[model samples]
Target: MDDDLVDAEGNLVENGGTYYLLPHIWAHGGGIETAKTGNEPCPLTVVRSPNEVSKGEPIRISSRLRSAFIPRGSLVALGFANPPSCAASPWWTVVDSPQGPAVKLSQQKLPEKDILVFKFEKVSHSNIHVYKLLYCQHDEEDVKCDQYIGIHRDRNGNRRLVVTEENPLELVLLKAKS
Candidate 1:
């Protein structure tokens, strides 16, 4: 981390002629402006232009997270590039799915709230989404420590669940752990 280049407020103090956004160290997502420094829960959404899935193709979910951050012992704190809405809880609902994984949104409906729901079938399943330093450790310098979104057993191990995207067959939590 370049302390001389960034201010106490986490803003860029100096860039010289170039600018940079440090993936795990610094990021901007959700609604907050300043780069998040911790694993603060940020709201994510999947939105379609028409608000619903029409064709068989996949619609991208607008989401962002920190590349890596402070790990909580056995539990890894999920970090976001941006802070969640400081004003309100960003609401997202999954509308439909054609294949794998099921997601549910908040049931309480506040008509005055800014809730967005999107429906989609699938997207790229087993690719690394982000990386952690010591959490995913390998001796070699060439080994990349990373994380990816995948289907996994829930608390009870009764159901195959996934968030954001659906029916990811290959890329999964099990693969990321290895």
Candidate 2:
């Protein structure tokens, strides 16, 4: 249905179903803007400067932190929402979460885009349910996640993965020493 936000696999991504969607990066707003939001417990600050590291690197988000208040655990996530369908065009926007601005402490290739990072709770109107839906996909220890999950594709034919087992979000583990 055109009333939902599909994943890079084309299928309607369900809750607990790790997916990678294109976030409609925006400035300060209100409400569950994109089904997910927020920063990790021990945040990874982004350094500004076109020549430093973490410039465009995406900060990992956890399932528990994508909420109104801070969450526990270490299940960080990578944000990937979609652009509003009805708008002619929107400008790329950025904002500061519990962490500082969405930039890296140093500099390098910045994400060029904004992605909400946090954990997911139950499915409802304001949750991932707004853009995703639960479906039946077999469980794989190497690829299976919390419950059962899968990925989806957009109008085009691009492949994407939710933050499940085999398709977890990309995390930049290497950093330069000060």
**lDDT winner:** 2
Encode model 1's per-residue lDDT on 21-65: one tens digit a residue: 112212211111122211324323221112122221111112122
Q: Relative to the true structure, how large is the alpha-carbon lDDT of every model?
A: 0.24, 0.26
Superposed model 2: Cα runs more than 4 Å off = 21-100, 103-178
Compose the digit string of candidate 2's lDDT tens values, residues 1-178.
3333233333433333333322222231111112111232222222111222212322222232334322321233332133233222211222333321232121122332232223233333332232221212232347523531222222332222232233222211211112
The TM-scores of all predictions, comma-separated, are 0.19, 0.20
Would you give me the overall lDDT of model 1?
Answer: 0.24
Tell me, by TM-score, which candidate is best: 2
Candidate 1 ranges beyond 4 A from true positions: 1-69, 72-97, 102-104, 108-129, 132-178
